[PDB]
Amino acid sequence: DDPLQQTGQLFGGLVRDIRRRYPYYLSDITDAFSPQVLAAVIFIYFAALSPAITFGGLLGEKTRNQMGVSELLISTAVQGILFALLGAQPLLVVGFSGPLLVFEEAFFSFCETNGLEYIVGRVWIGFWLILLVVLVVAFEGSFLVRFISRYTQEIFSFLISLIFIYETFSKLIKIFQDHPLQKTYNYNVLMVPKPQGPLPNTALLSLVLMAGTFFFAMMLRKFKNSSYFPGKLRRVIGDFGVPISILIMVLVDFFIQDTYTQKLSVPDGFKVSNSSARGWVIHPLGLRSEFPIWMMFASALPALLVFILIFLESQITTLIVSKPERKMVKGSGFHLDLLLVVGMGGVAALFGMPWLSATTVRSVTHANALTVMGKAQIQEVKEQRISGLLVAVLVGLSILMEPILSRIPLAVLFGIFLYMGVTSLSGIQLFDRILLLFKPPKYHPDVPYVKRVKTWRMHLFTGIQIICLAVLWVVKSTPASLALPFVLILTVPLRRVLLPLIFRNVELQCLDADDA
């Protein structure tokens, strides 16, 4: 009944993952029949689409359109469908992540200097990824995930929420920089790719649209837990809170005629970003020049970095989502999900498309959206495969449905990202204890780590975790940002060898507890 356990047989953990979950397959279809599930699809679609559009454009720039938006929309769609149908935890949301973009910029630059075909180079990384994951899953290497405690989990989940919130505000500020509040503006600026010079009212409306969307989202959640209107109506308006918030502020922008705001932009059709550079299928041996044999072997080194990047964020995401506290009964599979994510990623390379990963903020948003609230306590979660399938299909079709998307401002979606980031800081005990730094000890809750631990020692423990977050944020800022996963790893030694010198066993049990 314990997922993270070494059996002895090859592919032991994987067979136990399939046998565990696939019996519930029909339930994974019939549980989706609920308007809450539909409200979840609409929400998580916009969560899933905007990153693909944003990161896809950054790949286009950094890579000379050898990979761009089209490639990432297709990858996100196809890998999204396959994972929704075959995966052990369907509530995970596979997609491109900041760390993966950083690597792609890094590997491109290497190939420019050394005179390699970048897109052909990725194919060999992809072959090594397939070889690595089939070895790991064979010898049941996912069992090591059991040594990642709450301590490391909450440092990770908290950092990822802060970064998410930080980047959203960075995007708002960019608008102000591009379109500053001036006395006079040139009034013949071209709009062909984008506004050439600054224009009036764009930055302040963007702020209003953002602040508007966030407010309605937060208010309709407050309303959901209120005692106004009949419960059946109040629950439904609460479920569709985010889609209502979006629809309101999208109509606000629609009626405001003469003021410019940035809209979502998908590619024209389904075709590679640079048609001259590459086709659909990338040749291993080379496109123009012969691919060198040393790099076919040397690609093993980048493959290990990409593996670790995908593994850590994906397996920790799974831990966070599949916690006992959140009422998920169907069962998670670490062995099966690893194989699909990394396996599909290795194959994607061969069609010049990005390998993806189970991303934390989106996956957690998706899981929270399907959670029903009793009395406030968690009653159950709507664990099904339809939400994840429909979002993957919609992201794929997004190119066809440009007429709808071309009327949605980004500023509106920034409000929904602010909502997602804030809402994600919920069951994290780190955040709870950080708040108790500011409350006096009289008005502290009756949770075990308050009663059984002295207030200053509890605070010392919180402070040490805050110092970890600081060190992680500094490494983030420096050029060596691909090290972040390997610095998270060091949080496991800290907890296991260092902290027991300072804190006694009884304190470390209550503070860093498995089930709470």
Ligand X SMILES: */C(=S)=N/C1=[C]C(S([O])(=O)=O)=C(/[C]=[C]/C2=C(S([O])(=O)=O)[C]=C(N=C=S)[C]=[C]2)[C]=[C]1
Ligand Y SMILES: CC(C)CCC[C@@H](C)[C@H]1CC[C@H]2[C@@H]3CC=C4C[C@@H](O)CC[C@]4(C)[C@H]3CC[C@]12C
Ligand Z SMILES: CC(C)CCC[C@@H](C)[C@H]1CC[C@H]2[C@@H]3CC=C4C[C@@H](OC(=O)CCC(=O)O)CC[C@]4(C)[C@H]3CC[C@]12C
Ligand U SMILES: *[C@@H]1O[C@H](CO)[C@@H](O[C@@H]2O[C@H](CO)[C@@H](O)[C@H](O)[C@H]2NC(C)=O)[C@H](O)[C@H]1NC(C)=O
Ligand V SMILES: CCCCCCCCCCCCCCCCCC(=O)OC[C@H](COP(=O)([O-])OCC[N+](C)(C)C)OC(=O)CCCCCCCCCCCCCCCCC
- Enumerate binding residues for ligand Z (CB under 6 A): 437, 456, 459-460, 463, 466-467, 470
Taking phi first (over 0 means left), then psi (-120 to 50 degrees means alpha), and beta for anything else, what does residue 510 get? alpha
Contacted by 460, from ligand Y, ligand X, ligand Z, none: CB < 5 to 8 Å by type: ligand Z
List of long-range contacts for 104-108, beta carbons under 8 Å, 24+ apart: 104/59, 104/62, 104/63, 104/67, 104/354, 105/62, 105/63, 106/482, 107/302, 108/62, 108/63, 108/66
Rounded CA-CA distance 494/469 in Å is 13
The nearest distance, CB 125 to ligand U, in angstroms, is: 20
Binds ligand V (CB under 6 A): choice among 29, 131, 173, 490: 173
Per-residue contact flags (x/-) with ligand X for residues 431 to 470, judged by CB under 6 A: ----------------------------------------
Contacted by 326, from ligand U, ligand Z, ligand X, none: CB < 5 to 8 Å by type: none
Q: Counting contacts by CB under 6 A, is residue 425 touching ligand V?
A: no
Taking phi first (over 0 means left), then psi (-120 to 50 degrees means alpha), and beta for anything else, what does residue 331 get? left
**Which residues between 246 and 275 bind ligand X (CB under 6 A)?**
none
Binding piece for ligand U, criterion CB under 6 A, among 37-45, 71-79, 193-201, 270-278: 270-278
Binds ligand V (CB under 6 A): choice among 208, 244, 298, 499: 208
Binds ligand V (CB under 6 A): choice among 11, 24, 176, 185: 176
Q: Is 15 helix (H, G, I), strand (E, B) or coil?
A: helix
Q: Counting contacts by CB under 6 A, is residue 435 touching ligand V?
A: no
C-alpha 455, offset from chain centre: 35
Binding piece for a second copy, criterion CB under 8 A, among 179-187, 316-324, 490-498, 506-514: 179-187
> DSSP string covering 324-381, please?
SSS---S---HHHHHHHHHHHHHHHGGGT----EE-HHHHHHHHHHTEEEE--EEEEE
Residue with tokens 């599930």: 37
Binding piece for a second copy, criterion CB under 8 A, among 46-54, 128-136, 253-261, 267-275: 253-261
Contacted by 218, from ligand V, a second copy, ligand Y, none: CB < 5 to 8 Å by type: ligand V
Per-residue contact flags (x/-) with ligand X for residues 130 to 159, judged by CB under 6 A: -----------------------------x
Q: Counting contacts by CB under 6 A, is residue 250 touching ligand Y?
A: yes
Contacted by 247, from ligand X, ligand U, ligand Y, none: CB < 5 to 8 Å by type: ligand Y
The nearest distance, CB 162 to ligand V, in angstroms, is: 13
C-alpha 412, offset from chain centre: 19
Binding piece for ligand X, criterion CB under 6 A, among 96-104, 216-224, 284-292, 431-439: 96-104
Residues 6+ apart with CB under 8 A from 344: 79, 82, 83, 355, 356
Rounded CA-CA distance 325/322 in Å is 9
Strands, E assignment, 158-291: none
Q: What are phi and psi of 357, to 5 degrees?
A: -160, 150
Contacted by 180, from ligand X, ligand V, ligand Y, none: CB < 5 to 8 Å by type: ligand V
